[PDB]
Design an enzyme around this catalytic site. Structure first.
Site, short mmCIF file in Angstrom:
data_model
loop_
_atom_site.label_atom_id
_atom_site.label_comp_id
_atom_site.label_asym_id
_atom_site.label_seq_id
_atom_site.Cartn_x
_atom_site.Cartn_y
_atom_site.Cartn_z
N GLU B 34 19.35 61.79 41.61
CA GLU B 34 18.32 61.09 42.37
C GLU B 34 18.89 60.18 43.43
OE1 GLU B 34 15.27 61.12 42.42
OE2 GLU B 34 14.58 59.04 43.08
N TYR B 35 20.15 59.39 42.94
CA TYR B 35 20.78 58.82 43.87
C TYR B 35 21.12 59.65 45.24
CZ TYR B 35 24.54 56.54 46.44
OH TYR B 35 25.37 55.99 47.43
N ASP B 36 21.53 60.87 45.10
CA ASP B 36 21.92 61.90 46.16
C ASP B 36 20.93 62.05 46.96
OD1 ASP B 36 24.03 62.96 47.67
OD2 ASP B 36 22.46 64.62 47.40
N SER B 81 52.00 34.86 45.18
CA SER B 81 52.72 35.87 44.02
C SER B 81 52.49 35.30 42.72
CB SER B 81 54.38 36.19 44.14
OG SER B 81 54.75 36.95 43.46
N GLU B 114 43.26 38.43 31.78
CA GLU B 114 43.02 39.72 32.33
C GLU B 114 43.79 40.71 32.27
OE1 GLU B 114 42.22 38.70 36.90
OE2 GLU B 114 41.69 36.79 36.05
N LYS B 116 46.44 43.30 34.02
CA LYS B 116 47.25 43.39 35.18
C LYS B 116 47.42 44.66 35.82
CE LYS B 116 49.39 42.17 38.92
NZ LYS B 116 48.05 42.78 39.34
N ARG B 137 47.93 42.89 51.47
CA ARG B 137 48.71 41.62 51.25
C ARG B 137 49.82 41.61 52.03
NH1 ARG B 137 53.22 39.56 48.59
NH2 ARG B 137 53.22 37.67 47.86
N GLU B 174 42.64 44.10 43.52
CA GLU B 174 43.49 45.31 43.49
C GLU B 174 42.92 46.63 43.97
OE1 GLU B 174 47.01 43.86 42.57
OE2 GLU B 174 47.88 45.58 41.39
N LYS B 291 45.79 33.14 33.07
CA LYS B 291 45.70 32.04 34.13
C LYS B 291 44.93 30.54 33.47
CE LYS B 291 44.46 35.23 37.73
NZ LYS B 291 43.32 35.65 38.54
C1 LIG Z 1 26.13 63.94 43.92
C2 LIG Z 1 26.78 62.43 43.20
C3 LIG Z 1 26.09 61.45 43.57
C4 LIG Z 1 26.52 60.43 43.03
C5 LIG Z 1 27.50 60.23 42.19
C6 LIG Z 1 28.13 58.81 41.54
N1 LIG Z 1 26.98 57.79 41.93
C7 LIG Z 1 25.73 57.75 41.11
C8 LIG Z 1 24.70 56.60 41.65
C9 LIG Z 1 23.67 56.40 40.60
N2 LIG Z 1 23.55 57.35 39.67
O1 LIG Z 1 22.75 55.59 40.70
C10 LIG Z 1 25.35 55.78 42.42
C11 LIG Z 1 26.26 55.64 43.41
C12 LIG Z 1 27.11 57.04 43.06
O2 LIG Z 1 28.19 57.10 43.87
C13 LIG Z 1 28.35 61.19 41.92
C14 LIG Z 1 29.34 61.23 41.22
C15 LIG Z 1 27.71 62.63 42.50
C1 LIG Z 2 49.03 38.31 42.87
C2 LIG Z 2 47.97 38.28 41.94
C3 LIG Z 2 47.79 39.25 40.93
N1 LIG Z 2 46.78 39.27 40.23
N2 LIG Z 2 46.29 40.31 39.17
C4 LIG Z 2 45.21 39.80 38.42
N3 LIG Z 2 44.79 40.26 37.59
N4 LIG Z 2 45.21 38.44 38.92
C5 LIG Z 2 46.01 38.16 39.94
N5 LIG Z 2 46.31 36.86 40.63
C6 LIG Z 2 47.15 37.00 41.51
O1 LIG Z 2 47.50 35.94 42.26
C7 LIG Z 2 46.88 34.59 42.15
C8 LIG Z 2 47.34 34.24 41.00
C9 LIG Z 2 47.53 33.68 43.31
#
Ligand SMILES: Cc1ccc(Cn2cc(C(N)=O)ccc2=O)c(C)c1
Ligand SMILES: Cc1c[n+]2nc(N)[nH]c2nc1OC(C)C
Ligand SMILES: Cc1ccc(Cn2cc(C(N)=O)ccc2=O)c(C)c1
Ligand SMILES: Cc1c[n+]2nc(N)[nH]c2nc1OC(C)C
Lengths: 318, 318
Positions: B34-36, B81, B114, B116, B137, B174, B291
């Site tokens: 549906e999305y596609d 860091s 969290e 890492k 970074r 990240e 943290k």
């Molecule tokens: C063909 C196709 C379309 C979309 C996706 C994954 N997806 C789904 C939605 C959704 N369900 O709302 C939204 C964004 C998205 O990236 C895949 C893997 C393959």
């Molecule tokens: C370098 C870094 C890397 N990370 N990774 C997480 N999860 N939090 C986080 N915070 C970072 O830095 C702030 C604490 C400054």
């Protein structure tokens, strides 16, 4: 060979040795007048025979010309900062952490303990024993070229006192202004309607940013060396204290209050001793710098890049 | 008003909402087909009526042209860091130290905990809700402009999901490659005689340094946001967790394994829980980031500049 080249060589050696005894050892073998007699004899002789004048002679500390501005120097090895503590429990936590983090904790854990001077951080390069360049710390990466100002500092040798100096040696330390000099400077500035300084730290910083070395030379500045940067053509000692003793043995001024302390409780004794001594030192100190004495343990512990004190990454073991 | 402008506006809103449900909530309200269906209807309509094509439309993630090279970006706020720990006693020492260093220690001391992630650190700038710039970074001060590559990342919104976005908002986090994608990429590279990657971290880094966004787009990359840089035109929450909940509420992906823990013993429970979960996450983690949750306590604690772990300045009280 000539008699005047030999007289110059003898006067220079004699004067460097007396400057060492006076400034580093605090044990002059002759009166101040005897040192001056030889100093001004060397100075007249060099002016009468200028072909033999050398750039590192004891008479050539002050450039005759004020500079136009300060060039920038990118340090080859970065000048790092220091973590801090404000209590015994906090210091004890820092030690507890090193104790756990080390692969093998030695019995005892020896610290090199020093007073923390309240001055300007500098880097001084000696090339085959000769003072060639000096820079402020700046941001730890880049600083200002203050060679002409550093050369005016009486206890800074223009030549290392050894017949086998390293190929290159960078001395790191602090430039400060003792109390007596600071009080004299402020009295002079008051008696000659000029800017007074709020504290010795401001007087030292202001003196080192003077573009005229002739003004810096009139400021009562002192160096205390606390570390080494570049060290090429030498096997540096494997403990921090021995490296400081080695700098002192080749002509570099080092603080005489430095001690070795085994374990946290002895280190706190040092901290307390220095804290009671504060009123009798004759220069300002903010606290004490406590360092792991063994270089291999320092290397193993390494450094922490600019990071928060409010976060930590507890990593998983392999 | 025109019917085609309204159809475009409706399709775009619908698609951004489904991308949010799919990528951030992990709870899609419609099937992928549906999305596609709506995605390719939007794409055809925009090509049939190009005057109405917008640069942040869901169909415009991939630049048609490979870049010549990467420009440099000096960060406005430095990317810091993280300190690290390798044991419970070491973590406990870090906490003991914060406990002493704080003016007033609260009961309880809450940490935002969290996992890492094991990827590449990035900074993504949104200006009045629109993604305009993204950088690596690098060294924490200067990095590379990877805007065209970051735009290809499916869970990275080109527009913030709020009618009142901040004037400027920089998201920090990240970029990583989950296991499934990493295994598929290496199988594909083997089946089409190409360079295989040793681990997901290398696959993510290599994907982000591609000059052709068309190649980056084929790499299964994911963002997990962990912080904020620039924040202008907004009153950010006063706890770190609430700031992360706020990013999640305006369209930014955040890790679902994040928790609040009161005191060191609960935090170690989290560390252990995440350590047992490692085998079931579907992406790589090196450890846990713990943290201080209260922002005022973080601000009070501040940061430590690049310094040794083997030295400390025990300062004297006033
Ligand atoms: C063909 C196709 C379309 C979309 C996706 C994954 N997806 C789904 C939605 C959704 N369900 O709302 C939204 C964004 C998205 O990236 C895949 C893997 C393959
Ligand atoms: C370098 C870094 C890397 N990370 N990774 C997480 N999860 N939090 C986080 N915070 C970072 O830095 C702030 C604490 C400054
Ligand atoms: C006139 C004069 C000359 C020297 C000094 C101090 N001093 C003495 C010696 C010395 N005794 O070997 C060496 C170097 C030096 O700087 C002062 C204060 C005044
Ligand atoms: C910045 C600094 C300052 N001080 N001061 C002393 N006494 N030692 C010392 N060491 C320093 O730095 C090294 C430990 C890197």
């Amino acid at each position: 060979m000539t008699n005047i080249q030999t007289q110059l060589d003898n006067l220079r050696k004699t004067l460097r040795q007396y400057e060492y005894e006076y400034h580093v050892l605090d044990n002059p073998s002759v009166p101040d007048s005897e040192y001056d007699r030889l100093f001004h004899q060397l100075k007249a002789l060099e002016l009468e025979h200028p072909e033999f004048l050398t750039s590192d002679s004891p008479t050539q500390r002050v450039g005759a010309k004020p500079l136009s501005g300060f060039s920038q120097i990118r340090h080859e090895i970065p000048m790092l900062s220091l973590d801090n503590a404000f209590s015994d429990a906090e210091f004890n936590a820092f030690v507890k952490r090193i104790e756990d983090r080390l692969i093998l904790l030695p019995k005892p854990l020896t610290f090199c303990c020093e007073p923390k001077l309240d001055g300007l951080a500098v880097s001084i390069l000696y090339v085959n024993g000769e003072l060639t360049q000096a820079a402020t710390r700046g941001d730890g990466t880049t600083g200002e070229d203050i060679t002409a100002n550093i050369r005016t500092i009486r206890n800074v040798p223009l030549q290392l006192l050894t017949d086998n100096p390293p190929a290159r040696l960078e001395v790191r330390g602090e430039v400060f202004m003792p109390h007596a000099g600071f009080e004299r400077l402020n009295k002079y500035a008051l008696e000659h309607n000029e800017k007074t300084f709020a504290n010795p730290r401001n007087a030292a910083a202001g003196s080192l940013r003077q573009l005229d070395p002739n003004i810096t030379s009139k400021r009562p500045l002192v160096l205390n060396a606390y570390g080494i940067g570049i060290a090429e053509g030498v096997d540096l000692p494997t403990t921090h204290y021995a490296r400081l003793q080695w700098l002192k043995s080749i002509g570099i001024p080092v603080n005489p209050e430095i001690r070795l302390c085994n374990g946290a409780d002895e280190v706190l004794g040092f901290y307390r001793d220095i804290q009671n001594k504060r009123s009798s030192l004759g220069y300002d100190i903010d606290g004490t710098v406590l360092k792991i004495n063994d270089i291999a343990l320092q290397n193993e512990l390494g450094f922490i890049s600019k990071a928060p004190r409010w976060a930590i990454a507890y990593k998983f073991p392999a």
